[PDB]
Amino acid sequence: QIVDCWETWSRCTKWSQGGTGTLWKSCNDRCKELGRKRGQCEEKPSRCPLSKKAWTCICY
């Protein structure tokens, strides 16, 4: 949830952070940080430093 931006569904679910840093932990843990069950890559540029892509795992 905190800092995640990709283009392909498989990308935001496995990685996180533009350029791939060290705090990805997949969409699973990246959503566990907010106490959510799962996450789906939605087109939300509100959290995407790369607006050309605008794909990020939305925690549900």
Instruction: Tell me the domain boundaries of the chain.
Output: 1-60
b/e string for 7-39 if b means 16 or more Cβ within 10 A? eeeebbbbbbbeeeeeebeebeebbbeeebeeb
- Residues with Cβ within 8 Å of residue 32, at least 6 apart in sequence: none
CATH class of the domain defined by 1-60 = alpha beta
- Residues with Cβ within 8 Å of residue 35, at least 6 apart in sequence: none
Strand partners, 6: 55
Residue 20 in tokens? 């791939």
Do 16 and 2 contact (CB within 8 A), yes or no? no
- Tell me the residue type at 7: E
